[PDB]
């Protein structure tokens, strides 16, 4: 799990969120194995990960990474699209399928409160919008 920091464990709130020891970190633990591998080599673009091994303490992973500067990738147009500067640190904005499902993005009759992000569908549905002719 995770343990919210809270010095000596007294969250100073109402009792509805009082405990500390079984709050469970709403993004995925495969996705936490990239920010602590992206910062080790910030000059490379994280492509994707995959599970490999699992003991009782260390969920092992690999992460496939690409040099965006090695000009066999800047040429050879099958993978030049990751050299684009929108994809810089492509993980922490939630873009790999490790993070796509943590954001919970598909379409259907299930995912109403998330199909473009759960902050746009929050924002478009409760902004009052007023026309200059009062409809």
């Amino acid at each position: 799990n995770r343990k919210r920091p809270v010095p000596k464990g007294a969250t100073y709130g109402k009792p509805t969120n009082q405990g500390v020891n079984e709050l469970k970190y709403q993004r995925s633990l495969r996705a936490t194995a990239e920010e602590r591998v992206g910062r080790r080599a910030a000059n490379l673009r994280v492509l994707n990960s995959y599970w490999v091994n699992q003991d009782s303490t260390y969920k092992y992973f690999e992460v496939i990474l690409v040099d965006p500067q090695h000009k066999a990738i800047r040429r050879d147009a099958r993978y030049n699209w990751i050299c684009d500067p929108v994809h810089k640190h492509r993980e922490a904005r939630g873009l790999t399928a490790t993070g796509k499902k943590s954001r919970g993005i598909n379409k259907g009759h299930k995912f109403n409160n998330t199909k473009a992000g759960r902050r746009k569908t929050w924002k478009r549905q409760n902004t009052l919008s007023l026309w200059r002719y009062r409809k």
């Binding site: 009792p15 509805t16 969120n17 009082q18 405990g19």
Partner: protein, 105 residues
């Protein structure tokens, strides 16, 4: 109080629709339930932290609780409901209230 048995009341049914002869029992309200509906809207809400959403009840005043008689029939094994007044000792068996001749001295 004493209540005798066999209590021939107006049955209703759809077979007789007049006075046919029953027999009397009281009941118990059974276990509450698991997997019901309103309980599923309790252990969905008392889950997690916080605890104790819906009010518990401490201040009690009633002595007895309005004992009730099932009138179960014979002709088709239907039954019915009845509610006499509240009673803190409900004697259901025989024990005929006779002409008490001597009064135990």
């Amino acid at each position: 109080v004493n209540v005798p048995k066999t209590r021939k009341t107006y049955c209703k049914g759809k077979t007789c629709r007049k006075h046919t002869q029953h027999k009397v029992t009281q009941y118990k309200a059974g276990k509450a339930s698991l997997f019901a509906q309103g309980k599923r809207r309790y252990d969905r809400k008392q889950s997690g932290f916080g605890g104790q959403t819906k009010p518990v009840f401490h201040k009690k005043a009633k002595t007895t609780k309005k004992v009730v008689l099932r009138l179960e029939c014979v002709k088709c094994k239907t039954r019915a409901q009845l509610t006499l007044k509240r009673c803190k000792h409900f004697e259901l068996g025989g024990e005929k209230k006779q002409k008490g001749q001597a009064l135990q001295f």
